[PDB]
Design an enzyme around this catalytic site. Sequence first.
Site: not given
Lengths: 312, 312
Positions: A59, A62, A186, A238, A256
């Site tokens: 992530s 991102k 992705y 998050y 993660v």
Amino acid sequence: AMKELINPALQLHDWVEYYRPFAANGQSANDSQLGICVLEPDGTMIHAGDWNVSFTMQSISKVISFIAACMSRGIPYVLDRVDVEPTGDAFNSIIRLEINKPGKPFNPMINAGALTIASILPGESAYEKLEFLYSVMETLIGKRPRIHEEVFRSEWETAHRNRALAYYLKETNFLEAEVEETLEVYLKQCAMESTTEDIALIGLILAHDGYHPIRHEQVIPKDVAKLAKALMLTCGMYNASGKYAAFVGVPAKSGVSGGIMALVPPSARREQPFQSGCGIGIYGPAIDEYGNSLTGGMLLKHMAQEWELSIF
Amino acid sequence: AMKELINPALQLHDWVEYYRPFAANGQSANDSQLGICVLEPDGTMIHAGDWNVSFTMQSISKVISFIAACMSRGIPYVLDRVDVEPTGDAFNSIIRLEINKPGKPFNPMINAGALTIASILPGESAYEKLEFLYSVMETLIGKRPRIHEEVFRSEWETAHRNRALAYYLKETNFLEAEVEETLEVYLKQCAMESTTEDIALIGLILAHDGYHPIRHEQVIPKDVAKLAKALMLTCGMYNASGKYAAFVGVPAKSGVSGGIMALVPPSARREQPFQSGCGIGIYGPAIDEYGNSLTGGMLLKHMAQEWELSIF
């Protein structure tokens, strides 16, 4: 050894040793690894633990793809496809894509939004989109990112949840590309390799609003760099972002796989340590229920509290 | 005199007149009033428009009650009753009180969390709890607060949704007092009056971590003041907080009556103006779908971008 160019060092040594054991409380979904790298504008670098061990960005990628999309399409275009609001839900939650009509993904940090971002990167295929992303990545860390193919293949076969999100996004017209093409981009970006040093450098660049302090060049437009930092603070961790803002107070982004990229803008570091700001790279494979590194998060909190890094 | 003590002035004059007309795109539920006050550490204040018009604090009061609760009970006790996470939902949403077991309110800025906060203020009656809130309020603005009785009577007769939240909180045991008692405290604190000057002074105090710059004394524990600022940034504008963080960048809190209390900590201002920080008070009765002042928000955004106030 612990300090080089490209108290704090000793404290970091001691803190890594102290927090490492807490890994037993988390999962990888070697869990005991714990590493950190802190970089300053003058190239000064301090590190401890498993700081030089390579891991997939997951992530954290991102933040880079969001920046690349903004640079290519412009912020307005991106905003029409993804918002910048916290969801209060898990990073891989699908709920709001159906409940919040028309179904625009809430932010680019959660999986849904990141998939939309990947689908809007410039290029006619997964290959071109990725080449663009890699070129941006190269201007940041000074080298073409290496892809951990074993991990990619692994995630590619078991990405059921992410495929669900992607197909739902396709259904509601929030994907500017085909689903499998988007998934490829992705999952490939998530598979880009890095050590705490690389993300610490990206962190440093963002801390300085897009200006690369080592190369002395504006590599990311300031307004885009600013936007990335804001999203990291509000959505980067998050549904644990609120706690991080309240008890750490530094823009941060997790993966993660156990990585955490954080940063501290100038002056917001406490006159004594890192007055000119810094980039932070942390690695702790054991993650909590939110998907954030358990020991890496504890280490960051300790640093922020001890050195007064909070921007609040 | 637009500037006194307890280009910026000219700019604010110009921007207030520019943004005032946009009120037509929102509603109050006078609608075109628009006022602002900026307070600096040296007691210097600047104002424009309807800066001296009294209005009810409404939700802005939530920052104060949250602070009062932390000062009285200590942060640990409060955190056991309310979390500090954004919900991604409306300020008066009840959904998560049922969905997210056991039902702890997500944060103290949304109505649910604020009701829990009201219930934990020290005292065995609404009058006792409020007396304490008013005493804290007095140390901040230097005077006993005035309550808009007419507004309180009105709120009290039609607060159906808030009673729904309160009874649900009682049901799940997240209300440390009787429902009607809690509603009284909540609606009374919401009816406390102020002008943009009063909330700018509170914002100034928070900007300086609880230190009253004009009275030269720590009126709010530093850790409590920092916590309030973090919650303001992450949850202060509810489901529009992400947008505010991304395009404005300063901790802010709204009230459905049209008020917006914002702040800028030292250095996080530019080089000028307000290098030492400032407290900001804004009033714009016409609110948007999120419950936030429409023209007030536009004014805050213009100031933030023009003077580079963003803390990121």
